[PDB]
């Protein structure tokens, strides 16, 4: 039990394929991080079909996945969410849990993760502690046994944030060799700090394991998190028993965030210094080297793509420059189509022609990305660039319509978005 | 040369697989429409690599695709876009065009479609007419030879809309057995009429073929067009030489628009009456019958899904009801948290609880759709429902925050969207 630094499949919608998970395991071996939790929402065998057992074909597929993870040199953690209605009462569903963990142990893996409310009331705390301790005693002593609480973030703890008493019950009543999952101050989890982890270490009397969601994208329309691993210090890695991350739903776009997270873990095993921009440019150089592979573009344009679709907490340099220029063209547009007023209109036309040149070069980047060698990495990235070029052309057309003397975009989702931004 | 009613691949990004095109051909055989134009943007052999030839493996794949279309009972039209810089001048690139059409004729197909500006200046009209007539004379007399002009819509004709003189040059100079592509009054092409097609038949002195884009979705973020085929009369089908349609980028979502278009063509071959709602409920019943297939939910919830992601020209009944209720809750929110004012606040709370019940039942529809048998049709539809549930919960949270005493969504695309809706 050294450190459980890995990548989960806690996102919704996409099942990653067997070769995608195999290349993920080989990337895990060559990068340094040594864990992989298996919680896919497409696989409903561990979520609601745990009363049922595993079949022959999907059992052999999971056995091949487990032995592929074993031969790659990483470890496999099977996350099963039966629900918070066990309470050790009837023990028929506890027998179903024991038979399910027996057949997963027959499939090859020995590490588990009991989930009650999966990270995306009352009188359940001591019952879930008893259920988790009886399951952990039934499996003897597994080396890496995880447990996700119902109040996995400070926004979900309803009595205050220090002592909601559910965290103190699962801190005192559970066995000391079981890890507790956590997310941070928020479920979306932007700008986390070591003080919340320190008071959680005070409450839980053990080091937790941070399920992170700084690269997750299932909760927003068109969000892509190709940004680096930022706003987490090295001492946050120091005061834990491991830290997982939830990447994007599309696998081939997750080269740069998993590589910056691998820098953030494996270089910090030796020395606690971390440069975000150096790891970002190293990951983007390795991503251009992976971009040239013809699996069925210079570094500057892919730097522009990474700096556009950044983290949810902060945009990139180019994105902030475009938002500042769009705000400047939107604010002082009354001097348009009109000595000092005429040169101010010429300055406004200079800024607007700079904006048109930015949309033209990002459309040329879209065509040059369309002429790529890799195609399965092309399709996962093309929709974001195409919709960005469309909304940037709509922005430029709106500014040009406001220059000289409705708007439907996004369908119903964009209609709801415009209905909650526009005021009375 | 009866009628070229078919489905194109003119969308961007997605290459449809061989089995997807095979099931598309079997659906084409069992529904009635008998054409398929091949213009995929992922295949750059016909767009810029037409100087190069076809390889052995992709040539055998195209030969298998052509013979699969032949054995299904439909016909195959190969669309090639060399560019508008031919002008019959050097004839080396004309020899490249002749060798490319020779190897496509060796692959099996005999129908073609010369494109100059693909539907998504000056002094080119008589040169492109000469190039198209020399190519059509080189191929003898193909039965179905198509030609897409540069000014394919009335919004692209720069001198007026009746006589831009490019349309009159390609109407008089071309051979009378060549069809001319058209889109309508707009490239996006909503609410088209028979009068524009009548004046185009006056100008072009032949019946055109309408490339339609009423179900296209590559040009907007999160747009899904699961709506029926609407706002096109039967006499529009009467005064043509065929009509194609551009469906969505995801293949398995295109059951209902291609089935309503198949109703709109094949039932109108016998009688020109068309019910939009009867064809919509027949296509949604056949889509539930296809929904139950376990290829790796009652009719009311899939009716709710189709009525949500409707056409770009008009929303459904449920979507208009939700927008009207959101506008009503947004408009008179000042009576909230406050005799007549108190019962008005209770009426406001009744409408807000109705809105919360609508978001709850659409999240339950999301979970019940997640428990489906088909998975490759699950993943193509899950992202739209998940982002709709997220933006509806954000709408309800904003209305509840406005009830009793920034906003980041979409990333950079949503930032541009909020920057072009919000005013000074």
Numbering used by the authors:
A (entry chain B), B (entry chain A): 4 to 123, 134 to 309, 352 to 393, 410 to 476, 489 to 507
Excerpt from the paper describing this PDB structure:
Nucleocytoplasmic protein O-GlcNAcylation is a dynamic modification catalysed by O-GlcNAc transferase (OGT) and reversed by O-GlcNAc hydrolase (OGA), whose activities are regulated through largely unknown O-GlcNAc-dependent feedback mechanisms. OGA is a homodimeric, multi-domain enzyme containing a catalytic core and a pseudo-histone acetyltransferase (pHAT) domain. Here, we show that the eukaryotic OGA pHAT domain forms catalytically incompetent, symmetric homodimers, projecting a partially conserved putative peptide-binding site. In solution, OGA exist as flexible multi-domain dimers, but catalytic core-pHAT linker interactions restrict pHAT positional range.
To determine the spatial arrangement of the pHAT domains relative to the catalytic core, the full-length TaOGA structure was solved by cryo-EM. Initial 2D classification revealed a well-defined homodimeric catalytic core but lacked clear density for the pHAT domains. Subsequent 3D reconstruction produced a map resolving the TaOGA homodimeric catalytic and stalk domains at 3.0 Å resolution, into which an AlphaFold3 model guided model building. The dimerisation interface of TaOGA buries 2700 Å2 of the total 20,000 Å2 surface area, accounting for 14%, as calculated by the PISA server, which is 20% smaller than the reported value for the hOGA crystal structures. The interface is largely conserved, differing at only a few residues, and forms a broad solvent-exposed hollow channel through the homodimer. The top of the stalk domains of this TaOGA cryo-EM structure are in the same tight arrangement as in the hOGA catalytic core crystal structures, whereas one of the TaOGA catalytic domains rotates away from the neighbouring stalk domain, which is reflected in a pairwise inter-Cα distance of 33 Å in TaOGA (Lys59) and 40 Å in hOGA (Val113). The absence of visible pHAT domains in 2D classifications and 3D reconstruction suggests substantial flexibility between the catalytic core and pHAT domains, despite the presence of a short linker (STDEYEESTLKNS) connecting them. Notably, several negative charges in the linker may contribute to electrostatic repulsion of these regions in the homodimer. Taken together, these data suggest that TaOGA, like hOGA, is a homodimer with dimerisation interfaces for the catalytic cores and pHAT domains, although the latter are averaged out due to the flexible linkers under conditions of the cryo-EM experiment. Notably, the linker connecting the catalytic core and the pHAT domain is smaller in TaOGA and not conserved between the two organisms, likely weakening the interaction between the catalytic core and the pHAT domains, resulting in no observed density for the pHAT domains in the cryo-EM structure of TaOGA.
